[PDB]
Amino acid sequence: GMDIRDFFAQSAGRWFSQRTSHHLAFKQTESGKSQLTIELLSVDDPAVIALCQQYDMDPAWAVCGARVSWDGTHEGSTVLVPIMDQGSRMEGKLLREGRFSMGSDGALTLITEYETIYSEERLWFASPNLRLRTSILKRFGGFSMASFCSEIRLGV
Amino acid sequence: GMDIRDFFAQSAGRWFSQRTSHHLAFKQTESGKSQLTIELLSVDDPAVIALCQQYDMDPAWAVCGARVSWDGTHEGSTVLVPIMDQGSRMEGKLLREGRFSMGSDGALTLITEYETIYSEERLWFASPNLRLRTSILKRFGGFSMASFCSEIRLGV
Numbered sequence: 001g002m003d004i005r006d007f008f009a010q011s012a013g014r015w016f017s018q019r020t021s022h023h024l025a026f027k028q029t030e031s032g033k034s035q036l037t038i039e040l041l042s043v044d045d046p047a048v049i050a051l052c053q054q055y056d057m058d059p060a061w062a063v064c065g066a067r068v069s070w071d072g073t074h075e076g077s078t079v080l081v082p083i084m085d086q087g088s089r090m091e092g093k094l095l096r097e098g099r100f101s102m103g104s105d106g107a108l109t110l111i112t113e114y115e116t117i118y119s120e121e122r123l124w125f126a127s128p129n130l131r132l133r134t135s136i137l138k139r140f141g142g143f144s145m146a147s148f149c150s151e152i153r154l155g156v
Numbered sequence: 157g158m159d160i161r162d163f164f165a166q167s168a169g170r171w172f173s174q175r176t177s178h179h180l181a182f183k184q185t186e187s188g189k190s191q192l193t194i195e196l197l198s199v200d201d202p203a204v205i206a207l208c209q210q211y212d213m214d215p216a217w218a219v220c221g222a223r224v225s226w227d228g229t230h231e232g233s234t235v236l237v238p239i240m241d242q243g244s245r246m247e248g249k250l251l252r253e254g255r256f257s258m259g260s261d262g263a264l265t266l267i268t269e270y271e272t273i274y275s276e277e278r279l280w281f282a283s284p285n286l287r288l289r290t291s292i293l294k295r296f297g298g299f300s301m302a303s304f305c306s307e308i309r310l311g312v
Contacts, residue, residue: 020176020185022306024286029176031185103261126276126292130180130299134290136282143286148304150178 002106003089004082005064010125012040014154017070021147034072036151041065041079051081055095116140129153158262159245160238161220166281168196170310173226177303190228192307197221197235207237211251272296285309 002010015038020031041048041064048065052058061083069077081095090102098112098119107124118138125131130152137145158166171194176187197204197220204221208214217239225233237251246258254268254275263280274294281287286308293301 018178018185020304022174024306024308029174029187127299132302134304143283146288146306148176148290150180150302152180
């Protein structure tokens with residue numbers, strides 16, 4: 001019964017991420033460990049504002065933001081900012097430095113599609129310290145990748 | 157918007173299964189390929205009846221059944237039979253040779269818990285020829301396993 005802002009807040013913190021990807025066509029599989037740092041940003045934060053106008057958007061719509069940093073294979077940091085839909089607290093657009101949807105079950109779904117490339121990710125908490133996510137990648141008329149991630153909260 | 161019977165019918169067929177499991181506590185991971193054969197059984201089928209009475213159940217409740225066979229590491233075959241809930245076509249009990257729940261999104265959820273061991277699996281179709289499933293295993297007060305499976309329909 002939580003919304004995006006709640007989901008974003010919950011995600012905040014340091015996590016150990018274990019990723020496994022299945023390459024459908026080649027019946028292969030590659031896995032990789034990684035560290036993740038999710039810090040919730042306030043609508044006031046300059047990073048948020050920058051992204052909004054960047055996407056030609058008004059910061060008055062940004063409900064919150066987040067800075068996701070990783071490390072492990074490659075590494076970096078990106079900022080995400082959700083823009084609400086007409087009178088909605090569950091669906092809208094997600095600005096990346098794509099569309100999102102919060103569901104009754106408390107799981108977030110992200111969808112970004114260009115032309116032949118469709119990407120669908122689903123994130124959810126199995127525990128306040130266990131975030132999981134699945135995803136599929138469709139490309140040139142065929143599914144090409146299916147992935148899973150286990151993220152356990154670190155602490156410190 | 158499909159129900160169990162529909163989900164069971166859809167699952168029927170031969171599939172190539174790719175499984176990856178993440179062992180949380182030890183930050184490990186093991187993957188394995190496998191073949192799967194799902195044949196839908198009718199309430200009339202003797203295998204179904206046997207299981208019902210076996211679970212001290214009346215075959216008049218069984219909406220359908222299924223024989224799941226696999227191969228690859230270990231191998232075998234088991235039968236599953238869903239028993240409906242009072243005036244319900246989405247939730248109920250699942251007899252294994254545990255509780256189930258069909259959702260609006262068309263994804264099935266299976267839950268079986270003894271005492272300290274909790275098991276939650278979620279199956280769904282990303283395509284009529286792509287069935288996916290995630291799961292978590294809680295044991296002795298701690299999550300111990302998270303898994304993902306990609307199943308692409310074979311044919312023949």
